[PDB]
Tab-separated table of C-alpha atoms (C1' of nucleotides) and ligand atoms in Angstrom:
chain	number	residue	atom	x	y	z
U	225	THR	CA	-0.063	0.163	-0.115
U	226	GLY	CA	3.022	2.112	-0.409
U	227	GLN	CA	3.207	2.700	3.641
U	228	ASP	CA	6.702	1.206	4.182
U	229	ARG	CA	8.684	3.967	4.866
U	230	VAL	CA	8.315	7.574	6.426
U	231	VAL	CA	9.548	9.956	4.006
U	232	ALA	CA	9.773	14.231	4.655
U	233	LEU	CA	10.358	17.047	2.167
U	234	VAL	CA	11.918	19.952	3.969
U	235	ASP	CA	11.707	23.652	2.373
U	236	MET	CA	13.344	27.003	3.557
U	237	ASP	CA	10.656	29.277	3.144
U	238	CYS	CA	11.546	32.152	0.765
U	239	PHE	CA	15.255	31.065	1.336
U	240	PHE	CA	17.315	33.939	-0.376
U	241	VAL	CA	15.066	36.549	1.297
U	242	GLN	CA	15.500	34.994	4.942
U	243	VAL	CA	19.601	34.867	3.993
U	244	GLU	CA	19.021	38.677	3.213
U	245	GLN	CA	17.169	38.898	6.319
U	246	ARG	CA	19.279	37.317	8.674
U	247	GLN	CA	21.903	39.552	7.894
U	248	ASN	CA	20.143	42.603	7.559
U	249	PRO	CA	17.403	42.886	10.803
U	250	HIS	CA	15.907	46.085	8.976
U	251	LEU	CA	14.655	43.361	6.587
U	252	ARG	CA	12.861	41.012	8.724
U	253	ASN	CA	8.954	40.937	8.873
U	254	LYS	CA	8.718	43.503	5.944
U	255	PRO	CA	7.402	43.001	2.534
U	256	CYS	CA	11.046	41.966	1.014
U	257	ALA	CA	12.452	40.392	-2.110
U	258	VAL	CA	15.778	39.376	-3.441
U	259	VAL	CA	16.683	40.655	-7.012
U	260	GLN	CA	19.880	40.130	-9.648
U	261	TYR	CA	21.324	42.747	-11.751
U	262	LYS	CA	19.497	46.186	-11.197
U	263	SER	CA	19.934	47.908	-14.474
U	264	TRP	CA	17.166	46.301	-16.365
U	265	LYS	CA	13.535	47.432	-15.128
U	266	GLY	CA	14.942	47.164	-11.373
U	267	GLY	CA	16.228	43.803	-11.748
U	268	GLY	CA	14.675	40.069	-11.938
U	269	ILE	CA	13.073	38.889	-8.599
U	270	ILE	CA	14.060	35.728	-7.567
U	271	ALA	CA	12.755	35.374	-4.090
U	272	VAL	CA	9.619	37.109	-2.579
U	273	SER	CA	8.762	37.131	1.334
U	274	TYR	CA	5.477	36.046	2.424
U	275	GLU	CA	4.392	39.761	3.616
U	276	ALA	CA	5.546	40.754	-0.043
U	277	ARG	CA	3.864	37.958	-1.902
U	278	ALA	CA	0.370	39.092	-0.355
U	279	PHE	CA	0.555	42.115	-2.649
U	280	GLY	CA	0.798	39.839	-5.536
U	281	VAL	CA	4.346	39.766	-5.844
U	282	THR	CA	6.249	36.646	-7.484
U	283	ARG	CA	9.254	35.538	-9.027
U	284	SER	CA	10.249	36.147	-12.262
U	285	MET	CA	8.741	39.753	-11.901
U	286	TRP	CA	10.952	43.289	-12.581
U	287	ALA	CA	11.388	44.940	-9.972
U	288	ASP	CA	10.138	48.209	-11.245
U	289	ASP	CA	6.835	46.298	-11.705
U	290	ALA	CA	7.021	44.530	-8.179
U	291	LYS	CA	7.117	48.247	-6.798
U	292	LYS	CA	4.001	49.230	-8.639
U	293	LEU	CA	2.230	46.311	-6.972
U	294	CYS	CA	3.712	46.761	-3.803
U	295	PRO	CA	5.309	50.784	-3.268
U	296	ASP	CA	7.180	49.885	0.257
U	297	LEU	CA	8.614	46.583	-1.287
U	298	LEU	CA	12.192	46.390	-0.002
U	299	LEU	CA	14.851	44.580	-2.129
U	300	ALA	CA	18.046	43.406	-1.503
U	301	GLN	CA	20.333	42.432	-4.647
U	302	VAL	CA	22.581	39.474	-5.410
U	303	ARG	CA	25.993	39.721	-4.938
U	304	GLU	CA	27.655	40.411	-8.304
U	305	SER	CA	31.285	39.288	-9.305
U	306	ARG	CA	33.110	39.072	-12.576
U	307	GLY	CA	29.987	40.706	-14.038
U	308	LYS	CA	27.869	37.782	-13.426
U	309	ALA	CA	25.650	37.241	-10.235
U	310	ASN	CA	27.432	35.387	-7.689
U	311	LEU	CA	25.321	32.793	-5.207
U	312	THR	CA	27.913	31.878	-3.067
U	313	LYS	CA	26.378	33.406	0.343
U	314	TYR	CA	23.503	31.476	-0.156
U	315	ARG	CA	25.133	28.429	-1.076
U	316	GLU	CA	26.877	28.649	1.786
U	317	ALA	CA	23.805	29.346	4.330
U	318	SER	CA	22.327	25.850	2.263
U	319	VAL	CA	25.401	24.083	3.934
U	320	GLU	CA	24.841	25.545	7.040
U	321	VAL	CA	21.268	23.801	6.947
U	322	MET	CA	22.375	20.492	5.570
U	323	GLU	CA	24.789	19.612	8.328
U	324	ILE	CA	22.011	20.214	10.782
U	325	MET	CA	19.214	18.121	8.953
U	326	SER	CA	22.286	15.575	8.165
U	327	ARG	CA	22.131	14.865	12.149
U	328	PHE	CA	18.662	13.656	12.354
U	329	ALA	CA	18.501	11.367	9.199
U	330	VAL	CA	19.428	10.363	5.639
U	331	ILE	CA	19.187	13.127	3.526
U	332	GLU	CA	19.478	13.904	-0.321
U	333	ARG	CA	19.719	17.293	-1.335
U	334	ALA	CA	17.080	18.385	-3.632
U	335	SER	CA	17.755	21.912	-4.891
U	336	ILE	CA	19.465	24.940	-2.814
U	337	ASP	CA	16.440	25.206	-0.272
U	338	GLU	CA	15.285	21.970	-0.158
U	339	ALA	CA	16.204	18.558	0.832
U	340	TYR	CA	14.218	14.637	1.253
U	341	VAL	CA	14.407	13.027	4.608
U	342	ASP	CA	14.094	9.440	5.411
U	343	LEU	CA	13.324	8.512	8.467
U	344	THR	CA	12.325	5.336	8.127
U	345	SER	CA	15.242	4.172	10.330
U	346	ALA	CA	14.800	7.203	13.038
U	347	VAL	CA	11.157	6.413	13.675
U	348	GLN	CA	11.742	3.035	14.437
U	349	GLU	CA	14.191	3.715	16.579
U	350	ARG	CA	12.110	6.362	18.110
U	351	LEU	CA	9.023	4.005	18.608
U	352	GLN	CA	10.886	1.049	20.539
U	353	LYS	CA	12.830	3.989	22.738
U	354	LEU	CA	9.474	5.384	23.298
U	355	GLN	CA	7.455	2.125	23.377
U	356	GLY	CA	4.418	2.650	25.687
U	357	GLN	CA	4.235	6.137	25.183
U	358	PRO	CA	1.157	8.378	23.787
U	359	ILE	CA	2.002	10.875	21.836
U	360	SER	CA	0.741	14.557	23.640
U	361	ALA	CA	-0.173	17.043	20.764
U	362	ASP	CA	2.543	19.330	22.572
U	363	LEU	CA	5.069	17.222	20.237
U	364	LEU	CA	3.827	18.718	17.513
U	365	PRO	CA	3.009	22.579	17.770
U	366	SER	CA	3.010	23.136	14.173
U	367	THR	CA	1.784	19.987	12.306
U	368	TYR	CA	-1.254	20.277	10.193
U	369	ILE	CA	-3.256	16.826	9.708
U	370	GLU	CA	-4.409	16.709	5.998
U	371	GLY	CA	-7.923	15.857	6.179
U	372	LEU	CA	-8.622	16.718	9.418
U	373	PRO	CA	-10.855	17.854	11.303
U	374	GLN	CA	-14.139	16.476	10.119
U	375	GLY	CA	-17.356	15.608	11.167
U	376	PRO	CA	-20.940	16.830	12.478
U	377	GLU	CA	-16.161	27.650	17.303
U	378	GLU	CA	-12.763	27.997	17.345
U	379	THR	CA	-12.730	26.344	13.938
U	380	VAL	CA	-13.289	30.085	12.324
U	381	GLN	CA	-9.537	30.928	13.693
U	382	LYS	CA	-7.030	28.634	11.718
U	383	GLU	CA	-4.927	27.741	14.556
U	384	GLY	CA	-8.246	26.134	16.195
U	385	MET	CA	-8.737	24.047	12.421
U	386	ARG	CA	-5.038	22.990	13.282
U	387	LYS	CA	-5.616	21.941	16.837
U	388	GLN	CA	-9.303	20.482	16.360
U	389	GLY	CA	-7.316	18.327	13.172
U	390	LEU	CA	-4.389	17.201	15.499
U	391	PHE	CA	-6.546	15.953	18.554
U	392	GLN	CA	-9.254	14.546	16.309
U	393	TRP	CA	-5.955	12.470	14.822
U	394	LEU	CA	-3.843	11.645	17.706
U	395	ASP	CA	-7.463	10.378	20.022
U	396	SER	CA	-7.547	8.102	16.773
U	397	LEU	CA	-4.309	7.301	17.099
U	398	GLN	CA	-3.922	6.559	21.109
U	399	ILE	CA	-7.454	4.058	20.684
U	400	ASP	CA	-5.755	1.955	18.245
U	401	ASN	CA	-8.376	3.122	15.488
U	402	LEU	CA	-4.949	4.435	13.350
U	403	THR	CA	-2.847	2.340	11.734
U	404	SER	CA	0.806	1.298	12.358
U	405	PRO	CA	1.675	3.094	9.302
U	406	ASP	CA	-0.320	6.223	10.484
U	407	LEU	CA	2.020	5.559	13.744
U	408	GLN	CA	5.035	5.661	11.948
U	409	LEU	CA	4.129	9.195	9.984
U	410	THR	CA	3.279	10.130	13.322
U	411	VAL	CA	6.460	9.867	15.017
U	412	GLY	CA	8.027	10.844	11.902
U	413	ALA	CA	6.152	14.585	12.314
U	414	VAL	CA	7.526	14.255	15.755
U	415	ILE	CA	11.171	13.694	14.480
U	416	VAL	CA	10.558	16.718	11.777
U	417	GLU	CA	9.529	19.031	14.680
U	418	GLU	CA	12.847	18.668	16.313
U	419	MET	CA	14.637	18.884	13.055
U	420	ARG	CA	12.987	22.369	12.420
U	421	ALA	CA	13.128	23.414	15.994
U	422	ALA	CA	17.308	22.661	15.663
U	423	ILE	CA	17.710	24.418	12.224
U	424	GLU	CA	15.810	27.061	13.373
U	425	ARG	CA	17.598	27.899	16.491
U	426	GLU	CA	21.107	27.290	14.680
U	427	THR	CA	20.698	29.246	11.711
U	428	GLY	CA	17.649	31.508	12.549
U	429	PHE	CA	15.939	29.947	9.581
U	430	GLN	CA	12.208	28.707	8.915
U	431	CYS	CA	10.943	26.322	6.990
U	432	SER	CA	8.220	24.137	6.041
U	433	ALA	CA	8.012	20.344	5.364
U	434	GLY	CA	5.700	17.522	4.241
U	435	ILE	CA	5.467	13.977	5.840
U	436	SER	CA	4.153	11.056	4.093
U	437	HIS	CA	5.227	7.787	2.938
U	438	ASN	CA	7.093	8.665	-0.519
U	439	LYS	CA	8.902	11.668	-2.020
U	440	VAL	CA	5.755	12.860	-4.017
U	441	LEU	CA	3.447	13.331	-1.325
U	442	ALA	CA	5.829	14.647	0.874
U	443	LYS	CA	6.258	17.436	-1.268
U	444	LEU	CA	2.930	17.820	-1.994
U	445	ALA	CA	2.234	17.850	1.378
U	446	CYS	CA	5.113	20.559	2.261
U	447	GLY	CA	3.179	22.863	0.124
U	448	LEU	CA	-0.279	22.500	1.783
U	449	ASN	CA	0.232	25.030	4.940
U	450	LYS	CA	3.420	27.694	4.494
U	451	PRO	CA	5.154	29.639	6.180
U	452	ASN	CA	6.682	27.964	8.994
U	453	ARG	CA	4.250	24.650	9.528
U	454	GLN	CA	4.435	21.041	8.151
U	455	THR	CA	2.014	18.789	6.973
U	456	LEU	CA	1.469	15.034	7.589
U	457	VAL	CA	-0.341	13.555	4.419
U	458	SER	CA	-1.719	9.596	5.249
U	459	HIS	CA	-2.093	7.311	2.805
U	460	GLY	CA	-6.143	7.418	3.847
U	461	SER	CA	-6.053	11.154	3.145
U	462	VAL	CA	-5.127	10.548	-0.695
U	463	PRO	CA	-8.486	9.652	-2.403
U	464	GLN	CA	-10.084	13.165	-1.013
U	465	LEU	CA	-7.162	14.960	-1.163
U	466	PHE	CA	-6.080	13.742	-4.877
U	467	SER	CA	-9.904	14.109	-5.863
U	468	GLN	CA	-9.665	18.002	-6.933
U	469	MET	CA	-5.870	18.045	-7.108
U	470	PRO	CA	-5.231	19.616	-10.434
U	471	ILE	CA	-2.892	17.176	-11.949
U	472	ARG	CA	-0.092	19.793	-12.607
U	473	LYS	CA	0.632	20.040	-9.066
U	474	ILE	CA	1.780	16.554	-8.769
U	475	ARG	CA	5.682	16.220	-8.986
U	476	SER	CA	6.852	16.051	-12.468
U	477	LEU	CA	3.041	16.512	-14.342
U	478	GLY	CA	3.933	20.079	-14.504
U	479	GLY	CA	4.961	20.606	-17.666
U	480	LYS	CA	4.241	18.508	-21.091
U	481	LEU	CA	3.637	14.749	-19.972
U	482	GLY	CA	1.106	16.204	-17.368
U	483	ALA	CA	-0.408	18.346	-20.378
U	484	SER	CA	-0.510	15.546	-22.496
U	485	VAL	CA	-2.201	13.201	-19.763
U	486	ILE	CA	-4.958	15.908	-19.318
U	487	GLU	CA	-5.552	16.032	-22.857
U	488	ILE	CA	-5.471	12.472	-24.212
U	489	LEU	CA	-7.402	11.384	-20.710
U	490	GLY	CA	-9.704	14.091	-20.704
U	491	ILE	CA	-9.345	14.571	-16.797
U	492	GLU	CA	-8.293	17.442	-14.457
U	493	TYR	CA	-7.703	15.735	-11.346
U	494	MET	CA	-5.227	13.550	-9.969
U	495	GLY	CA	-7.838	10.870	-8.731
U	496	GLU	CA	-9.058	10.403	-11.986
U	497	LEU	CA	-6.375	8.385	-13.042
U	498	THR	CA	-7.358	5.759	-11.184
U	499	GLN	CA	-10.299	4.559	-13.805
U	500	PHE	CA	-7.705	3.491	-15.931
U	501	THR	CA	-5.914	-0.156	-16.153
U	502	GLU	CA	-1.798	0.184	-15.701
U	503	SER	CA	-1.778	-1.352	-19.660
U	504	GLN	CA	-4.233	1.685	-20.581
U	505	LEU	CA	-1.532	4.094	-19.052
U	506	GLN	CA	1.286	2.726	-20.226
U	507	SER	CA	0.207	2.606	-23.535
U	508	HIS	CA	-0.340	6.515	-23.993
U	509	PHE	CA	2.772	7.478	-21.817
U	510	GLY	CA	5.024	4.887	-21.773
U	511	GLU	CA	5.982	1.694	-19.820
U	512	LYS	CA	7.457	3.702	-16.781
U	513	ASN	CA	5.467	6.871	-17.181
U	514	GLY	CA	2.255	4.149	-17.052
U	515	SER	CA	3.431	2.140	-14.144
U	516	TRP	CA	4.262	5.243	-12.158
U	517	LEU	CA	0.842	7.088	-13.120
U	518	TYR	CA	-0.950	4.002	-12.000
U	519	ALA	CA	0.684	3.753	-8.500
U	520	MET	CA	0.826	7.705	-8.056
U	521	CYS	CA	-2.375	7.936	-8.462
U	522	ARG	CA	-3.231	5.779	-5.748
U	523	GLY	CA	-0.771	7.247	-3.294
U	524	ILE	CA	2.317	4.995	-4.000
U	525	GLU	CA	5.802	5.819	-5.231
U	526	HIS	CA	8.777	4.152	-4.915
U	527	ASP	CA	11.613	6.405	-5.541
U	528	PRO	CA	14.276	6.268	-2.890
U	529	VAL	CA	15.411	8.891	-1.280
U	530	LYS	CA	18.980	9.074	-2.159
U	531	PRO	CA	22.140	10.017	0.308
U	532	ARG	CA	23.631	12.718	-1.367
U	533	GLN	CA	24.029	16.206	0.693
U	534	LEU	CA	26.341	17.024	-2.071
U	535	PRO	CA	25.806	18.488	-5.860
U	536	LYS	CA	26.889	16.348	-8.368
U	537	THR	CA	27.653	19.039	-10.756
U	538	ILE	CA	29.197	22.497	-10.240
U	539	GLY	CA	28.269	24.766	-12.917
U	540	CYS	CA	28.304	28.742	-13.874
U	541	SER	CA	26.456	30.577	-16.342
U	542	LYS	CA	25.378	33.712	-17.788
U	543	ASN	CA	23.176	35.208	-20.382
U	544	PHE	CA	23.795	37.838	-23.211
U	545	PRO	CA	20.048	38.507	-24.647
U	546	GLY	CA	19.697	41.360	-27.462
U	547	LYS	CA	22.055	43.852	-28.153
U	548	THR	CA	24.498	42.020	-25.631
U	549	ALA	CA	24.887	38.685	-27.704
U	550	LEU	CA	28.453	38.058	-28.264
U	551	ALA	CA	30.043	39.193	-31.533
U	552	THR	CA	33.436	39.240	-31.297
U	553	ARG	CA	36.112	36.169	-30.080
U	554	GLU	CA	37.861	38.637	-27.724
U	555	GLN	CA	34.251	38.842	-25.918
U	556	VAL	CA	33.710	35.227	-26.096
U	557	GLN	CA	36.903	34.351	-24.898
U	558	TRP	CA	37.027	37.311	-21.476
U	559	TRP	CA	33.709	35.944	-20.679
U	560	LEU	CA	34.757	32.102	-20.813
U	561	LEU	CA	37.764	33.118	-18.480
U	562	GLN	CA	35.285	34.844	-16.147
U	563	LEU	CA	33.091	32.042	-16.001
U	564	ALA	CA	36.477	29.947	-15.645
U	565	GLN	CA	37.442	32.022	-12.937
U	566	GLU	CA	34.129	31.407	-10.583
U	567	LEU	CA	34.691	27.915	-11.026
U	568	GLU	CA	37.828	27.605	-10.180
U	569	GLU	CA	37.285	29.169	-7.131
U	570	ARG	CA	34.422	27.064	-6.070
U	571	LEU	CA	36.007	23.813	-7.069
U	572	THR	CA	39.061	24.559	-5.108
U	573	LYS	CA	36.753	24.843	-2.309
U	574	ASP	CA	34.743	21.585	-3.282
U	575	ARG	CA	37.612	19.856	-3.547
U	576	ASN	CA	39.066	21.032	-0.221
U	577	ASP	CA	35.678	20.530	1.588
U	578	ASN	CA	34.570	17.377	0.006
U	579	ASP	CA	37.541	15.303	-1.036
U	580	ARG	CA	36.500	15.131	-4.385
U	581	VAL	CA	37.682	16.156	-7.896
U	582	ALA	CA	35.675	16.884	-11.094
U	583	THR	CA	37.104	15.257	-14.207
U	584	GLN	CA	35.373	16.191	-16.778
U	585	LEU	CA	34.090	19.860	-18.408
U	586	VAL	CA	30.982	20.718	-20.007
U	587	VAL	CA	30.911	23.789	-22.486
U	588	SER	CA	27.221	24.889	-23.209
U	589	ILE	CA	26.389	27.848	-25.499
U	590	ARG	CA	23.356	29.135	-26.901
U	591	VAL	CA	23.074	30.644	-30.758
U	592	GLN	CA	21.248	33.817	-31.115
U	593	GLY	CA	17.475	33.053	-32.272
U	594	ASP	CA	17.572	29.710	-30.118
U	595	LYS	CA	14.812	29.003	-27.567
U	596	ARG	CA	16.083	26.217	-25.723
U	597	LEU	CA	18.426	26.516	-22.773
U	598	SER	CA	21.161	24.898	-24.400
U	599	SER	CA	21.959	25.159	-28.418
U	600	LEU	CA	24.965	22.642	-28.011
U	601	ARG	CA	27.091	20.889	-25.414
U	602	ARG	CA	30.597	20.087	-25.760
U	603	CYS	CA	32.819	18.058	-23.291
U	604	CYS	CA	36.458	17.600	-22.438
U	605	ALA	CA	38.690	16.861	-19.686
U	606	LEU	CA	39.416	18.474	-16.717
U	607	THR	CA	42.704	17.552	-15.448
U	608	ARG	CA	43.711	20.768	-14.089
U	609	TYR	CA	41.679	23.600	-11.461
U	610	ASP	CA	43.532	26.561	-13.797
U	611	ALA	CA	41.096	28.978	-14.864
U	612	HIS	CA	43.048	29.824	-17.876
U	613	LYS	CA	43.475	26.485	-18.800
U	614	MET	CA	39.776	25.812	-18.499
U	615	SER	CA	38.473	28.653	-20.820
U	616	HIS	CA	41.277	28.172	-23.085
U	617	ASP	CA	40.153	24.408	-23.265
U	618	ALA	CA	35.896	25.365	-23.279
U	619	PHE	CA	36.967	27.961	-26.159
U	620	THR	CA	38.877	25.045	-28.175
U	621	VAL	CA	35.741	22.842	-28.361
U	622	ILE	CA	33.298	25.498	-29.291
U	623	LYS	CA	35.407	27.607	-31.664
U	624	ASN	CA	34.236	25.488	-34.625
U	625	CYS	CA	30.530	26.860	-34.015
U	626	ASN	CA	31.553	30.463	-35.266
U	627	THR	CA	30.452	30.659	-38.973
U	628	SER	CA	32.127	34.050	-39.671
U	629	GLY	CA	35.049	33.832	-42.273
U	630	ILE	CA	36.786	36.611	-40.153
U	631	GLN	CA	38.626	35.456	-37.348
U	632	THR	CA	37.428	38.370	-34.920
U	633	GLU	CA	33.738	38.460	-35.626
U	634	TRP	CA	31.493	35.525	-34.159
U	635	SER	CA	28.505	34.368	-35.781
U	636	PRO	CA	26.134	33.696	-34.964
U	637	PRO	CA	25.926	35.949	-32.065
U	638	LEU	CA	26.201	34.079	-28.349
U	639	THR	CA	23.178	34.213	-26.165
U	640	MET	CA	24.826	32.330	-23.663
U	641	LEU	CA	27.822	30.562	-21.871
U	642	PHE	CA	27.576	27.792	-19.571
U	643	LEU	CA	30.299	26.366	-18.055
U	644	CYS	CA	29.762	22.790	-15.641
U	645	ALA	CA	32.112	20.830	-14.274
U	646	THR	CA	31.209	17.283	-13.884
U	647	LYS	CA	32.204	13.455	-12.907
U	648	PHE	CA	33.550	13.712	-9.482
U	649	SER	CA	36.012	10.836	-7.976
U	650	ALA	CA	37.533	10.677	-4.759
U	651	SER	CA	40.038	13.176	-3.549
W	184	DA	C1'	14.836	40.707	-22.089
W	185	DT	C1'	12.742	35.461	-16.465
W	186	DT	C1'	18.699	34.798	-14.748
W	187	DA	C1'	21.096	31.288	-12.871
W	188	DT	C1'	21.477	26.417	-11.801
W	189	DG	C1'	20.331	21.828	-10.615
W	190	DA	C1'	19.044	15.940	-11.294
W	191	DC	C1'	18.179	13.076	-14.884
W	192	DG	C1'	15.561	9.848	-18.683
W	193	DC	C1'	16.251	9.280	-23.513
W	194	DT	C1'	18.927	7.873	-27.456
D	77	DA	C1'	28.498	11.078	-26.297
D	78	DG	C1'	24.797	14.894	-26.603
D	79	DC	C1'	19.998	16.391	-26.057
D	80	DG	C1'	15.245	17.438	-23.518
D	81	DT	C1'	12.089	17.746	-19.508
D	82	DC	C1'	11.128	19.493	-15.090
D	83	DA	C1'	12.383	21.841	-11.418
D	84	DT	C1'	13.025	26.415	-8.414
D	85	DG	C1'	16.526	31.092	-5.373
B	986	MG	MG1	11.530	25.713	-2.422
DNA sequence: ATTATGACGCT
DNA sequence: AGCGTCATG
């Protein structure tokens, strides 16, 4: 029934904003956003405080426009180094959080601001340790139970709803009404409360979490009650939760596959997938996608929390849109060098911290007039952490791309440059 | 003129 | 080895 594991997804609330707010107390509890590159339209917003979100401020919005919706919006700018955004401060902040989480359980770094947590073992330890002990509501001060309260005064307030639902849940657990998987999830949520308290105490950062039996449900659960709260999605809550859940909300269905599911099957909500046989879904969407959809619409997913706290690749890139697109050989080389230099510093830090060395260098560019993130990818050996070598090699593998008869000019002009270090080995 | 940056499946 | 999809600060 896909109730074998206890899995959490912890997500730092508006992470880059919290990083700037911890550093500059004047930004705390105010409508605030983080932007990069001030010159064009005041900067592109990449993170927004909940206070600012209330005014309709969103990410991918220009700061000048965000200021129209929210006149008192405060802005913090991403550091800029060698002509490009420098995300070091947030990478370092993210490391502080991951190292704390890693104390409680096996962690999978999902992105700069989120990680999956496999609590299956930690739960078992706590249960035998706490054998015969009832779980108090006081152990779950920030936990929502999805789907509760239900059934025929304080409910007008959201904290009231939260407690009433928690009490119904706990009372059921205590009387033996709710299952052993439900108990495991509950102890799981207790551990996540502790993890989230430790993160806040030791970093100042708040986060939300979802607790369920797999990564997809835990990630969905996480988004149900934000900010600074955590949500338990039990196996039993799935039918009602999915019954009105737009397909695009489920992890991996937010794009073309999701749209094709909706269009081909003529459905809107996740629960509607249950009517189809596994073979039916495999026929439309392929063997892997079909099997996954068949189990997922019933709340079952088997993808493991991978034990990996460290990124698999180390990369950096810069876009050069419109007029800014690079048109000279000298220009391309100079930006490659800027990219290579950031990369050298990050790689050397990586090698000292994490005892590994990258062995491959991937060069990626986007040619002018191409919509895809990458027009092309070429690879070469990464044999030394030297910015001059890396930029020189990077140029060598892409220099053929140039269409111009003249040596100096570059055609077609470049929309993007990207360097990625990959294929790490123990050092 | 979403920017910068990830993990991953398919081939 | 290189490309497409999906995600998000
Ligand atoms: Mg997030």
